[PDB]
Write a protein that binds this ligand. Structure first.
Ligand code: CN3
Ligand code: 8PE
Ligand code: HEM
Ligand code: HEM
Ligand code: HEM
Ligand code: UQ6
Ligand code: 9PE
Ligand code: 9PE
Ligand code: A1D6P
Lengths: 93, 248, 385, 54, 74
């Protein structure tokens, strides 16, 4: 077969990053470690650290769109009651 | 829209088949067929239900054979080509009171009563709507409402004007097992019988759902353990950097 | 070499799900594309077994669905898995598309991968419309009447397209018999576009939640992301089984258990929940031809997104103002679905018109303006002049 | 150790996986059906049938 | 033995909130009764009924009666 256009990823041995020199890494077998030692402190302390960093980007847009829907729902209930009958005739013209 | 155009909201009663581990009460399905035959069947058809599906649910095999043999069905024609009739068997469907819908409207002042085989699934509210409708006819309409002649008031119907009158009154049915047949007792029994007509799979579905949820929640907990074992070498990996000498 | 690398058919399996180099730091949001392939298999298998008992005539269609629910052994399991499995197919697809919006997956060099995914989304909306009309309930008849009458507003060819789409003068027997034959075919066209989707993914690989290069640290697919895929597969089947066996009619309408009638109008005509935001965009334009163009332009506006992003950094991970306006776009999409399930009344008419403006102004005004502001704030916060 | 009595160091082989899966299906089906009918006692048809005849 | 729902609706109509909601409906019904006797009731397009005051009394009766009705039925 013929070759194709150039890419930005390669394969094992020629993946295509910069040359590496001076970094050393260490690991330990999973059979030599004690099982599930992150069931307590990661679930309480670390998940609380990830929650409160990102909760103002979500709950300030969520409170804007919930306040808007709640006033539009309460104004439609007033327009179709008995007390809101002369306002219904003038917002329908 | 106005609350009268929506209809009144039906409350929540404590049905004994509500809940993930609950079946129908089969003594109330048997009592509800008797209120169907003696009250409802004058104007309503039940067209999706065959005679054979009642055996082992509310009656025996010998009882349903005698109930089906009181109606007449069309047979294959004669040797001369003339039509014929025959009594009913277990593979037949339960017959309705009218031959067509023109004859149904003529007996009900232009209105057409619907088929009740799927009426529980086809209304918003479910069993609570059917019970509130049959027991919610007031003795008088509220002051100011003008009803057309031939209509009745019911606040649970959208618009408040229904073409069905009040039908259920106290002690119009004599029950076999000796239960007192009040208005609320007979209205509870038809709604249980009509929920079985819409969902005859209901008792079997909730038992196969108990086997599926136990197996699938055990496979979910075992796969979290296996994933944390195989990833333990990557998660505790360490890196050190010593900058190379500028020979190069 | 190994036999899985030298065989012609096993090399395609080895290069995609065994030895494929993956970035080390991808999270559980990268597991949604694997769930979408499981959803497509469930829909094809449950639909073929139901099609052995189905009749598509106008007087036999509603009663053959009732025949499946009552007479076929485990036939209620086949239908409830099929009807609830379509809502689960759309929920995972919305989460898959929103992951690409947040992490900048549409950007170069992955523009062809984004464009093929937009074609898949249009073909899936068309498939769910055609199968919903095959029940022929009361919601099926009036939902097909509303959509097919939209094409009569096209100038000089309006009345010729709609009569050719009906096979007659209204929604009738030829309409339902041709809607079922087209419903059998389009899932096989979706399966061919999924293969073209995976071919464009293979030449560049996946992105990562940091937005930077991943060629420095890779791990293979087998025994890390095979067993991480199993966690979300078993959670998907468990939530779907709770809907199929314990609450099988929550995500539907009760009016679709009434047989369809061309002479009686229902009190409210509302779609399923996943078509509700696009139904509110259509009802906000008072002109009839401009409403059909605007509803189809709400899908095709995703194609302009590689050109209006003016940032030099890929993704929203380190951007404060881009994170705030992403969640404005998300909760605006939920409000459009709630408006589309209401009546045409005050104040819901004005609320749906402002929310339709915010949908289009995100892609065309908000994203190019705040991308440029964040480029300059990164510059002057470091350079001392 | 209790795991060493049956397998001693190894994984479970694929023959024991398929053989024990069929033993599992009959025991699990009987235990679930027995708990379900005891929870709903007095409401099934076999309880109502024994009162129209006795 | 009479109807169990009619006895529970009678009982909760004589509590303190029940007597207040009944009195509001009856003062509505008399002001509709002292009109319709005035000349002018041919066509008005602003004819008042008491559906809304009837819906208020029925909603209180259903909240009190529905959690405790099926304990009295066999
Ligand atoms: C119609 C119904 C359809 C439902 C289909 C559901 C199908 C599965 C959907 C899964 C999904 O949504 O995942 C995407 C996203 C993941 O966000 P993330 O914060 O978890 O990832 C971070 C890290 O990888 C965790 O890493 P972690 O340390 O938590 O991994 C270990 C974890 C694995 O468990 C899981 O199953 C994770 C999914 O172990 C445990 O949690 C122990 C539990 C006892 O999830 C979320 O962010 C949660 C919010 C979703 C919002 C959806 C709104 C629409 C309903
Ligand atoms: C054709 C047009 C198509 C448009 C498609 C739009 C449809 C949107 C429908 C909702 C889909 C879900 C919306 C949220 C998707 C999040 C995508 C994502 O990747 O979020 C990234 C963010 C992770 O944040 P970081 O990577 O910075 O690290 C912090 C992790 N703790 O992760 C998060 O912070 C998640 C926080 C929780 C998200 C809350 C979303 C709630 C949505 C509820 C909708 C249901 C209403 C009924
Ligand atoms: C216990 C007995 C009965 C039950 C449970 C029953 C059930 C129902 C139900 C569920 C409806 C539909 C309500 C709706 O669409 O919201 C209905 C409507 C109707 N029923 Fe009955 N029915 C009974 C007896 C009768 C009888 C005896 C008659 C006539 C003599 C009758 C005539 C009608 C009519 C005409 C309608 C149509 C009302 C309308 O559309 O306005 N029904 N019934
Ligand atoms: C991407 C794949 C598919 C999607 C999203 C899809 C969607 C749907 C939907 C939403 C319905 C209406 C369900 C209801 O409310 O009852 C439906 C019905 C139906 N579909 Fe599918 N479908 C898919 C594939 C298929 C295929 C490939 C077939 C046939 C070989 C099929 C056969 C049917 C049939 C026979 C019905 C009849 C009504 C019923 O049984 O519920 N589906 N489909
Ligand atoms: C049946 C439909 C689809 C299937 C089976 C599918 C499958 C996949 C798979 C397996 C991946 C691999 C990596 C990952 O999971 O993120 C992927 C990535 C991707 N898909 Fe889809 N997809 C579908 C629909 C879509 C749609 C509707 C879109 C966009 C409108 C889309 C756009 C993308 C993009 C941009 C990526 C690359 C994300 C990244 O690498 O960060 N796909 N898809
Ligand atoms: C993130 O990295 C990933 C990754 O995680 C995964 C999982 C994949 C794997 C692939 C997918 C997720 C795509 C999935 C494939 C499809 C969706 C193909 C389309 C599906 C089909 C063609 C289903 C075919 C089914 C049939 C033909 C039905 C068979 C008919 C029957 C059983 C009738 C039976 C009749 C009788 C008489 C018995 C990747 O490619 C990948 O990228 C490298
Ligand atoms: C549009 C979708 C189609 C694309 C799908 C491509 C991927 C298909 C996945 C197939 C899974 C693997 C199939 C089994 C592979 C083993 C075949 C084999 O051993 O090759 C043949 C055996 O011949 C056959 O029997 C053909 C099998 C037909 C398979 C029908 C499904 C012998 O192997 P061979 O000697 O060629 O190996 C060459 C090594 N240099
Ligand atoms: C079972 C499936 C078998 C799959 C067989 C695959 C072959 C069938 C396709 C035949 C070719 C027809 C399409 C080629 C059109 C050229 C596409 C193109 O130019 O790529 C894109 C533009 O097109 C798109 O965005 C997506 C088009 C989707 C096509 C949907 C049919 C440009 O890609 P480009 O080469 O420019 O790479 C970037 C370098 N700057
Ligand atoms: C109006 C109405 C009422 C009742 C049911 C249904 N409906 N039809 N199918 N399903 C699942 C339903 O809920 C509808 C259709 O609603 C919508 C909204 C946009 N589309 C659409 C867009 C593009 C294309 Cl190509 C096809 C359709 N359809």
């Amino acid at each position: 077969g013929p070759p194709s256009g150039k890419t930005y990823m390669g394969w094992w041995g020629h993946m295509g990053g910069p040359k590496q020199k001076g970094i050393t890494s260490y690991a330990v077998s999973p059979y030599a470690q004690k099982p599930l030692q992150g069931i307590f402190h990661n679930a309480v302390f670390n998940s609380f650290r990830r929650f409160k960093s990102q909760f103002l980007y979500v709950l300030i847009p969520a409170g804007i769109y919930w306040y808007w829907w709640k006033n539009g729902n309460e104004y439609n209930e007033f327009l179709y009651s008995k007390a809101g009958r002369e306002e219904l005739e003038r917002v329908n013209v | 829209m106005t609350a009268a155009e929506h209809g009144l909201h039906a409350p929540a009663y404590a049905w004994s088949h509500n809940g993930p581990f609950e079946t129908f009460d089969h003594a109330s399905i048997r009592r509800g067929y008797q209120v169907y035959r003696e009250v409802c069947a004058a104007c309503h058809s039940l067209d999706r239900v065959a005679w054979r599906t009642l055996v082992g649910v509310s009656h025996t095999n010998e009882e349903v054979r005698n109930m089906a043999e009181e109606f007449e069905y069309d047979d294959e024609p004669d040797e001369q080509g003339n039509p014929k009739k025959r009594p009913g068997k277990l593979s037949d469907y339960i017959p309705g009171p009218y031959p067509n819908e023109q004859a149904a409207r003529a007996a009900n002042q232009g209105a057409l009563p619907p088929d009740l085989s799927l009426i529980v699934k086809a209304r918003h509210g479910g069993c609570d709507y059917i019970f509130s409708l049959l027991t919610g006819y007031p003795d008088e309409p509220p002051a100011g409402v003008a009803l057309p002649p031939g209509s009745n008031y019911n606040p649970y119907f959208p618009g408040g004007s229904i073409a069905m009158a009040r039908v259920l009154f106290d002690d119009m049915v004599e029950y076999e097992d000796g239960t007192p047949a009040t208005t609320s007792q007979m209205a509870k029994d038809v709604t249980t019988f009509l929920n079985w007509c819409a969902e005859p799979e209901h008792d079997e579905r909730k038992r196969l759902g108990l086997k599926t949820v136990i197996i699938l929640s055990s496979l979910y907990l075992l796969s979290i353990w296996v994933k944390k074992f195989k990833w333990a070498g990557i998660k505790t990996r360490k890196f050190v950097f010593n900058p190379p000498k500028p020979r190069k | 070499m190994a036999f899985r690398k030298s065989n012609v058919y096993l090399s395609l399996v080895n290069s995609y799900i065994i030895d494929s180099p993956q970035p080390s730091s991808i999270n559980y949001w990268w597991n949604m594309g694997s769930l979408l392939g499981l959803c497509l298999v469930i829909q094809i298998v449950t639909g073929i077994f139901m099609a052995m008992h189905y009749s598509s005539n106008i007087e036999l269609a509603f009663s053959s669905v009732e025949h499946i629910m009552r007479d076929v052994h485990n036939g209620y399991i086949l239908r409830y898995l099929h009807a609830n499995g379509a809502s689960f197919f759309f929920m995972v697809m919305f989460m898959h598309m929103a992951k690409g919006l947040y992490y900048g997956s549409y950007r170069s060099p992955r523009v062809t991968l984004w464009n093929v995914g937009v074609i898949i989304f249009i073909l899936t909306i068309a498939t769910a419309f055609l199968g919903y009309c095959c029940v022929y309930g009361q919601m099926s008849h009036w939902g097909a009447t509303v959509i097919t009458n939209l094409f009569s507003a096209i100038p000089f060819v309006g009345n010729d397209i709609v009569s050719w789409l009906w096979g007659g003068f209204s929604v009738s027997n030829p309409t339902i018999q041709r809607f079922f034959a087209l419903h059998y075919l389009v899932p096989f066209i979706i399966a061919a576009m999924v293969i073209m989707h995976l071919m464009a993914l293979h030449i560049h690989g996946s992105s990562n939640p940091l937005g930077i290069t991943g060629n420095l640290d890779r791990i293979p697919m087998h025994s890390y992301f095979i067993f991480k895929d199993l966690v979300t597969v078993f959670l998907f089947m468990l939530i779907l089984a709770l809907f199929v066996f314990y609450s099988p009619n929550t995500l539907g309408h009760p009016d679709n258990y009434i047989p369809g009638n061309p002479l009686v109008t229902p009190a409210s005509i509302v779609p399923e929940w996943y078509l509700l935001p696009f139904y509110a965009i259509l009802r906000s334009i008072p002109d009839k031809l401009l409403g059909v163009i605007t509803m189809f332009a709400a899908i095709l506006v995703l194609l302009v997104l590689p050109f209006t992003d003016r940032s030099v950094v890929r993704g929203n991970t380190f951007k404060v103002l881009s994170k705030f306006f992403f969640f404005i776009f998300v909760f605006n999409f939920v409000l459009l679905g709630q408006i589309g399930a209401c009546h045409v009344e005050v104040p819901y008419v004005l609320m749906g018109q402002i929310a339709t403006f915010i949908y289009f102004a995100y892609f065309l005004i908000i994203v190019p303006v705040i991308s440029t502001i964040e480029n300059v704030l990164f510059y002057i916060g470091r350079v001392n002049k | 150790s209790l795991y060493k009595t049956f397998f001693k160091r190894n994984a479970v082989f694929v023959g024991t996986i398929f053989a024990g899966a069929f033993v599992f299906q009959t025991v699990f089906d009987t235990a679930i059906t027995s708990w379900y009918e005891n929870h709903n006692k007095g409401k099934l048809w076999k309880d109502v049938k024994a009162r129209i005849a006795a | 033995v009479t109807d169990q729902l009619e006895d529970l609706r009678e009982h909760f109509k004589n509590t303190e909130e029940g007597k207040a909601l009944v009195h509001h409906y009856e003062e509505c019904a008399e002001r509709v009764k002292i009109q319709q006797q005035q000349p002018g009731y041919a066509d008005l397009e602003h004819k008042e009924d008491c559906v809304e005051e009837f819906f208020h009394l029925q909603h209180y009766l259903d909240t009190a009666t529905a959690p405790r009705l099926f304990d009295k039925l066999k």
